[PDB]
Write a protein that binds this ligand. Structure first.
Ligand SMILES: O=P([O-])(O)O
Ligand SMILES: [Mg+2]
Ligand code: NA
Ligand code: NA
Length: 256
């Protein structure tokens, strides 16, 4: 089984690339963040007509998350029970081929002194509660997406420049640890304990061409999935395309 997560930085813009990714060596499940499309503007026909089932949660301009799979997604769930009236479209879950898939587009946070950083804190607390509950029922569970958190200094290029800055702060790293502490494994680091595996590269300054990025897109797995884990890779071919998303897809492959 292959599961890919990709922050597409607008699905309107990236649709042809999503289509090309589904057409050649496709994953079994592709989850998307930053649709940036209202619910009724999601290109459902374009993907469905390719033989893919889609569930999604969109809003105008911002955010937006989708799950795309050749299996029909079951028991679809939207949002966070502990933050039930947040209008921001950031969490969608569904059971796909017996695996509980929770797709997140986590709060960026902006800056440690931004009011959006307090939002980030409360939002992560709410996510932890939902994930903890979901894990009591599904032995095969995958929590994946753009976490907007770089777990350790190997995940932030030039770590001295990012010392207690957004994405790379000690407190953000604690929020990421709180998810692992539920009984989940950072899949990429199980397979590749050492080395840079950046998933986001700023468009400004040609950072992708300079190899300078953050590892903020992750695939967190329950033990039953960890035991079956074969590889985790960052799809830099897709990031190297003309007019790319600033994030690269990340794929985990499971082998039983
Ligand atoms: O969705 P924002 O406008 O609060 O960033
Ligand atoms: Mg973006
Ligand atoms: Na933004
Ligand atoms: Na790669």
């Amino acid at each position: 089984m292959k599961i890919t997560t990709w922050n597409v930085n607008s699905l309107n813009v990236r649709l042809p690339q999503v289509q090309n990714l589904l057409a050649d060596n496709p994953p079994d499940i592709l989850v998307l963040q930053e649709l940036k499309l209202d619910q009724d503007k999601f290109p459902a026909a374009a993907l469905q007509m390719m033989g893919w089932h889609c569930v999604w949660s969109g809003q105008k301009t911002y955010n937006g998350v989708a799950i795309v799979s050749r299996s029909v997604p079951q028991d679809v769930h939207f949002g966070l029970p502990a933050l039930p009236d947040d209008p921001q479209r950031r969490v969608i879950a569904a059971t796909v081929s017996g695996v509980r898939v929770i797709n997140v587009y986590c709060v960026n946070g902006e800056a440690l002194d931004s009011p959006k950083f307090k939002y980030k804190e409360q939002w992560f607390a709410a996510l932890t509660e939902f994930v903890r509950d979901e894990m009591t029922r599904h032995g095969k569970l995958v929590l994946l997406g753009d976490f907007n958190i770089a777990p350790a200094d190997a995940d932030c290029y030039d770590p001295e420049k990012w010392h207690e800055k957004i994405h790379c702060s000690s407190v953000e790293r604690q929020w990421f640890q709180n998810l692992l502490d539920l009984g989940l494994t950072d899949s990429l680091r199980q397979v590749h304990p050492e080395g840079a595996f950046y998933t986001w590269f700023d468009y400004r300054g040609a950072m992708f061409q300079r190899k300078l990025g953050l590892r903020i897109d992750h695939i967190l797995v329950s033990p039953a999935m960890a035991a079956a884990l074969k590889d985790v890779r960052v799809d830099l071919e897709t990031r190297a395309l003309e007019r790319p998303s600033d994030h690269a897809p990340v794929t985990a492959e499971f082998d039983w």
